[PDB]
RNA sequence: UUUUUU
């Protein structure tokens, strides 16, 4: 329990970020399908002006949407896919990855965000120490799906995100896509089961992290034998700005998508702007490194976030990580303006697969 | 994917 708490206004004076580097990738689907070092679920961006001129309705198909994530019974916070891909990478070099924290981008994002307007309740994770490193996972085994009717704002907003993915992405590059396919994206059923994730090594301050992140597609082209961070794009839906209150909202979405992308080196953002009827009006591309300067013309928010990020990283890295500390377990939360760490005594969580599975523990021993 | 007063 030693450094049990970290105040949300704490800041490290160091803005130093590492160049993030792609280590690996993997494709998943509900029903436990995992494919290590496989890019099957990586999509390609294609949304021509001609398509946008057709007045794309991002609420279309909401009633017949197959919510495969909602229907699945699977552990959405699990590190299993990440660790498997990591194992395979370490197996190439026959050597543990050099890093302090192993986690999902989404969870780190939530950690940073809770100092800048993000909900404190979104931070609810486990930290387990093992082999000199910290393993961090969402505590929740399943996400919180909107349960209101499908004609509701809350449901349409939720769906539109996936609908815009279907209208703006392709399974393969344009050249390799049948015409029937290019011209009928409006008809096709929207899915959320299939995912593609990158696994990246990055850093802030003195500390290095390994982050899994879900990736929306390739913007321009893929390098089969190179690092594809620079080619990835993050897709996002936002309400068309026409009022002072819209603008402030959009500034938040910008800061937020900047959190989402800078963490793992994704430099391309595309935002589909909708009206209140969920009709797509236009699309605008942004470069991630540009967002902080854009926000400056509205704030020092990005620089502070980085200082916060370094503070919480060094704070978490103060947890004991020596040979006697294997399988210690902690709950990480946010409340009353601070982050909290609390050691746990739950032998079933610590000895089961929920955080670090046996096959991975066994793999790391085989290395010492 | 949705929300986040920041
Ligand atoms: Mn996808
Ligand atoms: Mn995504
Ligand atoms: Mn997206």
What is the Cα–Cα distance from A152 to A158, expressed in whole angstroms?
10
Whether nucleic acid strand B comes within 7 Å of the CB of A237, the answer is yes
Decide: helix, strand or coil at residue A124: strand
* Nearest ligand by distance to the CA of A42: 1
- A139: nearest Cα among A77, A211, A82, A213: A77
Beta-carbon count within 10 A of A255 CB: 22
Beta bridge partners of A22: A200
**Residue nearest B4 (alpha carbon to C1'):** A118
Residue ranges of alpha helices (H) inside chain A are 49-52, 68-71, 80-93, 105-113, 153-168, 179-182, 244-262, 291-296, 301-317, 347-351, 358-365
Q: In angstroms, what CA-CA distances link A40 with A37, A95, A352?
A: 9, 27, 31
Spacing of A271 CA from B5 C1' in Å: 23
Which tokens is A195 given? 């995912």
Which tokens is A27 given? 């494709």
What is the Cα–Cα distance from A73 to A30, expressed in whole angstroms?
8
For residue A216, report the distance from its CA to the centre of ligand 3, in Å. 6
* Nearest ligand by distance to the CA of A235: 3
Report whether A138 contacts A122 (CB < 8 A). Answer: no
Report whether A55 contacts A279 (CB < 8 A). Answer: yes
Spacing of A161 CA from B2 C1' in Å: 8
For residue A27, report the distance from its CA to the centre of ligand 1, in Å. 9
Q: Which of the nucleotides lies closest to A106 (Cα–C1')?
A: B1
Q: Which of the nucleotides lies closest to A157 (Cα–C1')?
A: B2
Which tokens is A53 given? 């001129």
For residue A234, report the distance from its CA to the centre of ligand 3, in Å. 5
Resolution to 1 decimal place, in Å: 2.4
Which tokens is A68 given? 């495969």
Task: Tell me how the structure was determined.
Answer: X-ray
Whether nucleic acid strand B comes within 7 Å of the CB of A274, the answer is no
What is the Cα–Cα distance from A134 to A84, expressed in whole angstroms?
16
Query: What would the DSSP string read from start to end of A297-344?
Result: T---HHHHHHHHHHHHHHHHHTS--SGGGTT-EEEEEEETTEEEEEEE
What is the Cα–Cα distance from A125 to A134, expressed in whole angstroms?
12
Q: Which of the nucleotides lies closest to A161 (Cα–C1')?
A: B1
């Amino acid at each position: 329990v030693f450094e049990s708490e970290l105040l949300l206004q704490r800041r490290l004076a160091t803005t130093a970020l590492k160049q993030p580097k792609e280590l690996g990738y993997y494709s998943t689907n509900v029903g436990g399908e995992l494919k290590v070092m496989d890019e099957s679920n990586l999509s390609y961006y294609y949304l021509p002006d001609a398509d946008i001129e057709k007045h794309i309705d991002l609420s279309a198909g909401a009633r017949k949407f197959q919510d495969e994530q909602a229907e699945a019974e699977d552990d959405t916070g699990s590190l299993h896919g990440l660790l498997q891909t990591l194992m395979e990478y370490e197996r190439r070099k026959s050597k543990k990855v050099n890093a302090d924290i192993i986690a999902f981008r989404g969870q780190v994002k939530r950690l940073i965000h809770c100092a800048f307007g993000g909900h404190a309740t979104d931070v609810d994770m486990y930290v387990m120490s093992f082999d000199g490193q910290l393993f961090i996972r969402a505590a929740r085994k399943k996400l919180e799906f909107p349960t209101s009717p499908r004609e509701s704002w809350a449901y349409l907003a939720y769906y539109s995100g996936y609908k815009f993915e279907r209208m703006a992405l392709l399974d393969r590059p344009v050249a390799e896509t049948p015409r029937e396919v290019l011209e009928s994206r409006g008809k096709q059923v929207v899915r959320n089961g299939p995912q593609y994730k990158t696994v990246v090594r990055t850093g802030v301050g003195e500390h290095k992290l390994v982050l899994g992140a879900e990736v929306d597609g390739i913007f321009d082209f893929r390098e089969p034998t190179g690092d594809n961070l620079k080619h990835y794009v993050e897709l996002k839906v936002a309400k068309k700005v026409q009022t002072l209150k819209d603008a402030t909202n959009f500034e938040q979405k910008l800061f937020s998508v900047w959190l989402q992308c800078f963490l793992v080196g994704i430099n391309r953002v595309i935002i589909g702007f909708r009206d209140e009827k969920f009709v797509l009006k236009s699309v605008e591309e942004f470069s991630t490194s540009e967002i902080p300067l854009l926000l400056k013309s509205t704030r020092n928010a990005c620089v502070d976030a980085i200082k916060w990020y370094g503070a919480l990283t060094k704070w978490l890295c103060e947890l004991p990580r020596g040979p006697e500390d294997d399988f210690k377990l902690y709950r990480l939360s946010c409340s009353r303006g601070a982050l909290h760490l609390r050691q746990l005594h739950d032998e079933d969580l610590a000895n089961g697969d929920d955080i670090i599975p046996g096959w991975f523990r066994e793999w790391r021993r085989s290395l010492s």
